[PDB]
Amino acid sequence: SGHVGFDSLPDQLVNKATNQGFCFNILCIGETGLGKSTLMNTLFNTNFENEPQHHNMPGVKLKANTYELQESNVRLKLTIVDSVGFGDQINKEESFKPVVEYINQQFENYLQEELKICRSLFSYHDTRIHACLYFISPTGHGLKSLDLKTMKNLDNKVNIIPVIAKADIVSKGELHKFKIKIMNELVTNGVQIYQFPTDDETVAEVNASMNTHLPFAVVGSTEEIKLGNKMVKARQYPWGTVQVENENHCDFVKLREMLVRVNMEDLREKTHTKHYELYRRSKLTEMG
Amino acid sequence: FDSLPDQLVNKATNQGFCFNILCIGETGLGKSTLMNTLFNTNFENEPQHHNMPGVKLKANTYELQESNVRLKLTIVDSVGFGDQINKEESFKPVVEYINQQFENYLQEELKICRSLFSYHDTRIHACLYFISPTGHGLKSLDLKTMKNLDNKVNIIPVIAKADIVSKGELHKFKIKIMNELVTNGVQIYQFPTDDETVAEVNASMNTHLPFAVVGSTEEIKLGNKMVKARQYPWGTVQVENENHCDFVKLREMLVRVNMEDLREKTHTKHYELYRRSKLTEMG
Amino acid sequence: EFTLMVAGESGLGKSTLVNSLFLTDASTVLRLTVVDTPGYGDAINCSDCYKPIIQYIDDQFERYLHDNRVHSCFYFISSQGHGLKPLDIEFMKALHNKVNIVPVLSKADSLTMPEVKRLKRRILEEIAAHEIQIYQLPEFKEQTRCLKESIPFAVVGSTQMIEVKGKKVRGRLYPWGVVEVENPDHCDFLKLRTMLITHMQDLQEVTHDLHYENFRARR
Amino acid sequence: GFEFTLMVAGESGLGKSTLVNSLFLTDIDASTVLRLTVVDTPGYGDAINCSDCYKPIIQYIDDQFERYLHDNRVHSCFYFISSQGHGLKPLDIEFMKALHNKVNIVPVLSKADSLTMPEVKRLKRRILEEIAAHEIQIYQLPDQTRCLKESIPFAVVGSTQMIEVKGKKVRGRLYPWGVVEVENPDHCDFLKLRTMLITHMQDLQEVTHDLHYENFRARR
Amino acid sequence: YVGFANLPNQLYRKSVKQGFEFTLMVVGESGLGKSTLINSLFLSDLYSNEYPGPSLRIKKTVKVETTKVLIKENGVTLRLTIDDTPGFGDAVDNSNCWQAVINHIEKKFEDYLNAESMVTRSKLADNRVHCCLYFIAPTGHGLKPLDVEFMKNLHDKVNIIPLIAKADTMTPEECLRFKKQIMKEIHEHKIQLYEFPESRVPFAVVGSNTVLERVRGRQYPWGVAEVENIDHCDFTVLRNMLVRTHMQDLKDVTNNVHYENYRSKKLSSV
Amino acid sequence: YVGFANLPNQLYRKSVKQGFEFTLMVVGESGLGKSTLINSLFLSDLGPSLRIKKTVKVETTKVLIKENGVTLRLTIDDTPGFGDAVDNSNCWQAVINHIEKKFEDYLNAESMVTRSKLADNRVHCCLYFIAPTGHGLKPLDVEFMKNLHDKVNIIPLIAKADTMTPEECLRFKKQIMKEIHEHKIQLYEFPECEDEEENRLNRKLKSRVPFAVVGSNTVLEIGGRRVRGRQYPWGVAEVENIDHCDFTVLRNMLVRTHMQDLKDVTNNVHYENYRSKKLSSV
Numbered sequence A: 001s002g003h004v005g006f007d008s009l010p011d012q013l014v015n016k017a018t019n020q021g022f023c024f025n026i027l028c029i030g031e032t033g034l035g036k037s038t039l040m041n042t043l044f045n046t047n048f049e050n051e052p053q054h055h056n057m058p059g060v061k062l063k064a065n066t067y068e069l070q071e072s073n074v075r076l077k078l079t080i081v082d083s084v085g086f087g088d089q090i091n092k093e094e095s096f097k098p099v100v101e102y103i104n105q106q107f108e109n110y111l112q113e114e115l116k117i118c119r120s121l122f123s124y125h126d127t128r129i130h131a132c133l134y135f136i137s138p139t140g141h142g143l144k145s146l147d148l149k150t151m152k153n154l155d156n157k158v159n160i161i162p163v164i165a166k167a168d169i170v171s172k173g174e175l176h177k178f179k180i181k182i183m184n185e186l187v188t189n190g191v192q193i194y195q196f197p198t199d200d201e202t203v204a205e206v207n208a209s210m211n212t213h214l215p216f217a218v219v220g221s222t223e224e225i226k227l228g229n230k231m232v233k234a235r236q237y238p239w240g241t242v243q244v245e246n247e248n249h250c251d252f253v254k255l256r257e258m259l260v261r262v263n264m265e266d267l268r269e270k271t272h273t274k275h276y277e278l279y280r281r282s283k284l285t286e287m288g
Numbered sequence B: 001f002d003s004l005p006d007q008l009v010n011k012a013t014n015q016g017f018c019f020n021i022l023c024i025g026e027t028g029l030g031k032s033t034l035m036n037t038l039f040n041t042n043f044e045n046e047p048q049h050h051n052m053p054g055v056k057l058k059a060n061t062y063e064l065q066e067s068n069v070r071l072k073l074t075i076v077d078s079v080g081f082g083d084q085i086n087k088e089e090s091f092k093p094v095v096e097y098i099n100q101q102f103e104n105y106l107q108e109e110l111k112i113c114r115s116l117f118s119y120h121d122t123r124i125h126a127c128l129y130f131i132s133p134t135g136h137g138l139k140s141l142d143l144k145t146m147k148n149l150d151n152k153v154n155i156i157p158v159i160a161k162a163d164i165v166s167k168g169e170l171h172k173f174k175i176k177i178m179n180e181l182v183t184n185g186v187q188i189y190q191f192p193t194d195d196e197t198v199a200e201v202n203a204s205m206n207t208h209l210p211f212a213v214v215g216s217t218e219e220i221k222l223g224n225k226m227v228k229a230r231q232y233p234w235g236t237v238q239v240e241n242e243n244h245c246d247f248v249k250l251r252e253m254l255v256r257v258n259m260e261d262l263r264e265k266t267h268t269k270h271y272e273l274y275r276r277s278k279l280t281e282m283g
Numbered sequence C: 001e002f003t004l005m006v007a008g009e010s011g012l013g014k015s016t017l018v019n020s021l022f023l024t025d026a027s028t029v030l031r032l033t034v035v036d037t038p039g040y041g042d043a044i045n046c047s048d049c050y051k052p053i054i055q056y057i058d059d060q061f062e063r064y065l066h067d068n069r070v071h072s073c074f075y076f077i078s079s080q081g082h083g084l085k086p087l088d089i090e091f092m093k094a095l096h097n098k099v100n101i102v103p104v105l106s107k108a109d110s111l112t113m114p115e116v117k118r119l120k121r122r123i124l125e126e127i128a129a130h131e132i133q134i135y136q137l138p139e140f141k142e143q144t145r146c147l148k149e150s151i152p153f154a155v156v157g158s159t160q161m162i163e164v165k166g167k168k169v170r171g172r173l174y175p176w177g178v179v180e181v182e183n184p185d186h187c188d189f190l191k192l193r194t195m196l197i198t199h200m201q202d203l204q205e206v207t208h209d210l211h212y213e214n215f216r217a218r219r
Numbered sequence D: 001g002f003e004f005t006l007m008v009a010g011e012s013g014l015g016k017s018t019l020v021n022s023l024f025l026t027d028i029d030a031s032t033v034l035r036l037t038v039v040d041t042p043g044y045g046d047a048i049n050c051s052d053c054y055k056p057i058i059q060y061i062d063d064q065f066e067r068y069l070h071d072n073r074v075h076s077c078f079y080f081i082s083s084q085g086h087g088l089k090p091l092d093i094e095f096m097k098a099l100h101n102k103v104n105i106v107p108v109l110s111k112a113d114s115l116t117m118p119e120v121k122r123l124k125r126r127i128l129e130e131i132a133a134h135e136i137q138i139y140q141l142p143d144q145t146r147c148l149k150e151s152i153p154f155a156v157v158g159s160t161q162m163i164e165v166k167g168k169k170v171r172g173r174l175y176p177w178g179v180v181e182v183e184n185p186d187h188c189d190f191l192k193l194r195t196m197l198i199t200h201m202q203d204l205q206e207v208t209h210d211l212h213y214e215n216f217r218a219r220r
Numbered sequence E: 001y002v003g004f005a006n007l008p009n010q011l012y013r014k015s016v017k018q019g020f021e022f023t024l025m026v027v028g029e030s031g032l033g034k035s036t037l038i039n040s041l042f043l044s045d046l047y048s049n050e051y052p053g054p055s056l057r058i059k060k061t062v063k064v065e066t067t068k069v070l071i072k073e074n075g076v077t078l079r080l081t082i083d084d085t086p087g088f089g090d091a092v093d094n095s096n097c098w099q100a101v102i103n104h105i106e107k108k109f110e111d112y113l114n115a116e117s118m119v120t121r122s123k124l125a126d127n128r129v130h131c132c133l134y135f136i137a138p139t140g141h142g143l144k145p146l147d148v149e150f151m152k153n154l155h156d157k158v159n160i161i162p163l164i165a166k167a168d169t170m171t172p173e174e175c176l177r178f179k180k181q182i183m184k185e186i187h188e189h190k191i192q193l194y195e196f197p198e199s200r201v202p203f204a205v206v207g208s209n210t211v212l213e214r215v216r217g218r219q220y221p222w223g224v225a226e227v228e229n230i231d232h233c234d235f236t237v238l239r240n241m242l243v244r245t246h247m248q249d250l251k252d253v254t255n256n257v258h259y260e261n262y263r264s265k266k267l268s269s270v
Numbered sequence F: 001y002v003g004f005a006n007l008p009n010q011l012y013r014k015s016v017k018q019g020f021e022f023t024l025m026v027v028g029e030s031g032l033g034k035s036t037l038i039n040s041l042f043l044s045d046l047g048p049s050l051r052i053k054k055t056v057k058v059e060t061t062k063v064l065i066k067e068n069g070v071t072l073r074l075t076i077d078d079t080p081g082f083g084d085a086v087d088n089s090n091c092w093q094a095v096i097n098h099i100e101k102k103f104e105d106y107l108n109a110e111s112m113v114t115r116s117k118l119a120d121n122r123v124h125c126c127l128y129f130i131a132p133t134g135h136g137l138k139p140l141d142v143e144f145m146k147n148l149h150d151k152v153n154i155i156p157l158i159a160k161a162d163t164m165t166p167e168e169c170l171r172f173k174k175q176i177m178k179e180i181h182e183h184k185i186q187l188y189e190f191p192e193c194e195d196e197e198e199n200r201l202n203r204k205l206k207s208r209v210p211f212a213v214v215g216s217n218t219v220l221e222i223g224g225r226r227v228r229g230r231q232y233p234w235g236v237a238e239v240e241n242i243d244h245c246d247f248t249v250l251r252n253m254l255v256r257t258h259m260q261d262l263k264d265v266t267n268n269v270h271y272e273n274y275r276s277k278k279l280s281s282v
């Protein structure tokens, strides 16, 4: 007051963060064949082919791959960690153990690089998983026991946005009933899935509360079919074409509006502040 | 930025100056009238009597104003000098007066807590010797006292009552005077003989020593310029005339040009010799 | 008489296709004995989920030894995955010694034609590799040949009633179109229903003569 | 006729030789020149301590007088008084006191040209009061004495010069500021001295013979 | 359009909702125009009539004081800390007068280290001294021994920005001569200044608060000393490069080298 | 008549051959415009401003400056580097020792049996520089005035007087005056001389001390006439008008109105006060 200045501080944050480079890690959990590789070739508009699984995997394991993407002038390194062999064995009581071990191993990598005397946290590359996409089988009856067990065992370690895979197989009366049943099982079991932000007066009330439609009923594929005058992505059937960019068929738009559009930095900040801080407190209390 | 003479003389005028003259000679030679006519102010010096048995010193101090200058003038007349029968020890009291003045100055300068500039200079600066106009030569007393005194004070030989002597006999008396002075090796106070360009001006006066002076207080009316002159029944003798008498030469030398020279010679040349002698005899 | 049991995972809709097949846990509704087997695999561990069906068929033959026999073992293999799970392969390898196995792909309306060709070839490869002796069924010649080629079948089901394009029929309503369960070009519902209708008696006699008779040889 | 002698004494430079040569028109020293014997004392007054000097002059006249008793005696003693003073110097008074009873003195003011009218009057009055105060008995001139004793001790000027004035050869001193004159009788008074010397030479000789010699003849 | 390009927008939102913190220390000889420059940098009455600047009030020991300001401008909330050392070099003997500055700076560093290393971390209140403006009297000859010894004893603990202080008391020719001599006296004594990322160091500063009609200037009996001119003084250079260009590069370097160099020394000692 | 009035002429003429000697000391922090103000004060190029360096011992310079027939033998005493060093305690000891050494040399020369004309070496005036802080005197300056004013004539000068708006110059000058009164620092003395005209002059001069003085060496012209001053992009800081600065009064007092007076105070007060302290100790 007297006159201006000091409005460029957020701009300086933006420039320094952009120069440093962005990093996002996504954990893809779902039974083999549900569309995880397909949905995340859909989500990032590129071909992340990763071999269509041996259904006779002796043990549940994780395939972690790292790629570089660039849009306009922002550069982001994706660590996509697919659960390979999950839900294929006869014995599934140990299905989620490797995934949790992997998450905690990445947390320990970060925390161990932090405590080193000659640390380089400014330049060191974090490997913690920022968002977890869970694939719900389009059963029509609810959520299976394995889905509940995995979500519960993994709710406090990474953000979960429940996603209905191959959602193009349920009718809309059935889809509404099945969605309401999912959220009923979620609240009754008390699963702390990732909820929309509330604080920001801009979007975090209107879009946040309007998107009370979780879980998202989404579909994915790689073929572009001609609808109207656009090569829109779609899943083809003898009786027609299921479009993915139209709201009335699937909820893929809202899922992307979380992951890549509006709440990605909230996901990273919650990973560093809500989950990493919990693990760090627990570990530092354990070690002394 | 070097107008320091103005402020120097401003402080001096705020203070005023001091001067001391001694008049030494036989009584009746005309000292008091000449000193009245030299400062043109009637100092009350009454007709004395010769019966003084020894040489005494009478001092009169006056404050004279002219323009802006105030001058503290101390005249010191020697009375009784050269009249008594025993004329051998007649040169001691003048010596003692000069040495007493120098002793006072030395004691005041060597005093620990001085009195700044308040040293009223009582040192006899000028000394006028009055020589009887006889036409033959110096008396024994005159040569004795002049030789014994030329190394203590600035001595100026002056012929008293110059109207007695004629010009030829005046010049003859001058020539045997200087012959006797050089023969007896007396360094009569010389005006600066080699003073840069004033060397000629203060060397011609040295050559003109001794002077011949005439004084008068009777203002007589000659022309419309009433003068200081003595009016004898045969003619009028002008005090301020270059043709008649050399009073104006003495006044010029003593007052207008060479006061501060006499003071500086008293301080630097004579007083420091006295200092050397006293400090050598001090221990 | 006929014992139609459907076997597989839980939640693949097989109850709906059962109700749609005849236009009208066990049910004796010809005396059609429907056995809507409880969809196993809902539990975390599926080691013992296979057992309940063996003793049921084992006891079934025991009363016969002491026509409830399962003439058709309708097996519904998931449309979601890439092929045969270890659970399905173990169950098919452990069951075909006794009860006549027939494979059918559940929820065919969730699958594309190139993929169903791919999954049929992979299913046949996994059957041949694990020496699984699946039923080869023996105008009658034409339907026999087509059924041999069409193994395994892909079938959709529907219970609710829809006014599609006019006439009131059974089907499914989707924003992309109507799934006509009756229509042969949409799925093999008609192929399955006609095969069972036309080969019911052959199934009974072959069960008695091959699967039941070698069981006597085993017994 | 008579053979007058003469004593002339005084301090150096008081114009003794000039006046004696001017008075008689002709040029211890006893010079014989009417037979004049001018006894002029060379050394008296210029010495450092002139204390004894009045004794040798007393000595010589006693020797001159006793030799005559055994006419060359000294009959008159012209004593010279310097014009500079306001009165009489101690030497002058002492010589007059110790010399007046041997030779008969004539007080005479040397160089009258130094004094103005009121000044010569004042100085003459002072000499009168001083001689009457020390009781000095000078030779009393025989009885117009009023303007003599007004002038006594005769103011005199002596000069062997004939300065030209009004076309006449006047006895006078020059200078450079008006000449003075000897014969002028206003207050130069050399005329008085010469006139009464000439006209009482005989009285002078007689008083010397009958008083000073007789006193000496009583002394001896 | 996976849409990653909206990530800078999200950074914008969170940064503008969480606010920013800055810490500026002002150290130098008293009477050099420190309070006026501080007021004219932020165009506000941080040092008002009731709370004047250091020399207008405080010189007791030679310690350091601080003041806070909240600036809400275009929705950006800036928490500004102005740290002044009131009475430095104004004593007869100035031996080891840098102790107060060093102790304060390492006090903030130790507070931040304790906050980070604690098991249960809250939001980190960043009170570390980010910028340090050192004032140099415009004598024109060279570094005073106190000044050079301060910089030599401070270059490895904080970002020192030397300032020429009084700058209208100093001709451009003598200004350039003093700058060059400052560079030389830094060079041969091995002084490592803050290498500004983007020759200008040290900057010249002049400020005023009495508005003259309407510009902030000083009305001398001969004219108007106006701050904003680029040729006259680099006050614009300091303002821009401190509060509009490198407000956070300074924070990055303080956390990146001046912090772990303090951490490596401390942890190896422990 | 009588000529007693021509004696000043004789003094004037005797003063020509000897020559007047002045010994002026300039004291202040390095960089405070000391050498430059000296150069501008005497209108002479004495420039140690380009001598960018520290110093060791008291710097004294002998010069001969002649004008209008008057010759000044000038000893300028520029102090070594003091106030700049970190340990400024007892930094005035060099100056005090220099003063006492000069006094002792002159007094010892006077006391000898053999005496020439005494070659004066005592410092006559001292000009002290105040840093233009605008708030108050530094403790070093106050201390050195306290330790110095009783030994030689001290005159305080506000160096860099061009850095202050007139209101601030007002406030700073009377702040300095109040501090001067409160520390009882009696500056160049003017106690109660009984003369009237000179007393009112000197009491009107006291009311202006300290002097806002700017030094330089330039000749810049202003539209209309050539002036002496400095340049800023907003004007010409002028040295020769009273409105813009107060150099004129300082130069007048120091050189052309009180310089002989300064010498008289030096000999008759400061020398004499030292002399009684010294000689009584003997």
Ligand SMILES: Nc1nc2c(ncn2[C@@H]2O[C@H](COP(=O)(O)OP(=O)(O)OP(=O)(O)O)[C@@H](O)[C@H]2O)c(=O)[nH]1
Residues within 6 Å of the ligand: A031, A032, A033, A034, A035, A036, A037, A038, A039, A050, A051, A052, A053, A082, A084, A165, A166, A167, A168, A218, A219, A220, A221, A235, C110, C111, C115
């Ligand atoms: N109808 C329909 N088919 C899909 C959908 N998503 C994937 N598919 C088909 O399923 C096949 C298997 O691919 P994925 O299920 O993505 O492979 P994955 O299960 O993710 O296993 P990984 O490659 O290891 O990640 C693809 O070739 C698609 O043809 C979908 O959303 N709807």
Ligand SMILES: Nc1nc2c(ncn2[C@@H]2O[C@H](COP(=O)(O)OP(=O)(O)OP(=O)(O)O)[C@@H](O)[C@H]2O)c(=O)[nH]1
Residues within 6 Å of the ligand: B026, B027, B028, B029, B030, B031, B032, B033, B034, B045, B046, B047, B048, B161, B162, B163, B164, B213, B214, B215, B216, D113, D114, D115, D119
């Ligand atoms: N012939 C002549 N007489 C002079 C001259 N000057 C003064 N007189 C006179 O000589 C007398 C001596 O004067 P003074 O000077 O008073 O004598 P003194 O020896 O100084 O003794 P005091 O009377 O005490 O002063 C005075 O009465 C004067 O009138 C002169 O130049 N020539």
Ligand SMILES: Nc1nc2c(ncn2[C@@H]2O[C@H](COP(=O)(O)OP(=O)(O)O)[C@@H](O)[C@H]2O)c(=O)[nH]1
Residues within 6 Å of the ligand: A139, A140, A141, A169, A170, A171, A174, C009, C010, C011, C012, C013, C014, C015, C016, C017, C039, C106, C107, C108, C109, C110, C155, C156, C157, C158
């Ligand atoms: N897309 C599709 N949906 C089906 C099919 N069969 C059943 N459903 C849907 O699945 C939901 C429940 O299936 P349900 O028959 O109860 O599964 P089941 O108990 O395992 O037989 C119903 O709402 C049906 O609409 C099918 O073949 N395709």
Ligand SMILES: Nc1nc2c(ncn2[C@@H]2O[C@H](COP(=O)(O)OP(=O)(O)O)[C@@H](O)[C@H]2O)c(=O)[nH]1
Residues within 6 Å of the ligand: B134, B135, B164, B165, B166, B169, D011, D012, D013, D014, D015, D016, D017, D018, D019, D110, D111, D112, D113, D156, D157, D158, D159, D173
């Ligand atoms: N004015 C004046 N000068 C005289 C007189 N008598 C002698 N003089 C000067 O004195 C000089 C020499 O005098 P002198 O006869 O030797 O003195 P004396 O021998 O003692 O009588 C001469 O040159 C004369 O000019 C006199 O009566 N008046």
Ligand SMILES: Nc1nc2c(ncn2[C@@H]2O[C@H](COP(=O)(O)OP(=O)(O)O)[C@@H](O)[C@H]2O)c(=O)[nH]1
Residues within 6 Å of the ligand: E029, E030, E031, E032, E033, E034, E035, E036, E037, E053, E054, E055, E056, E165, E166, E167, E168, E169, E205, E206, E207, E208, F133, F134, F163, F164, F168
């Ligand atoms: N010449 C000049 N004077 C200044 C400058 N800045 C401030 N001043 C003046 O210096 C005076 C004191 O400065 P401020 O307290 O008041 O100085 P500080 O104690 O160092 O903060 C103020 O009255 C200003 O008028 C500048 O850049 N140049």
Ligand SMILES: Nc1nc2c(ncn2[C@@H]2O[C@H](COP(=O)(O)OP(=O)(O)O)[C@@H](O)[C@H]2O)c(=O)[nH]1
Residues within 6 Å of the ligand: E139, E140, E169, E170, E174, F028, F029, F030, F031, F032, F033, F034, F035, F036, F037, F048, F049, F050, F159, F160, F161, F162, F213, F214, F215, F216
């Ligand atoms: N603004 C201003 N600058 C000055 C003044 N006098 C001198 N200067 C400059 O300031 C610097 C001071 O240097 P100098 O006088 O040699 O310092 P010192 O000799 O150590 O006291 C020089 O470069 C001058 O040009 C002044 O009155 N005002």
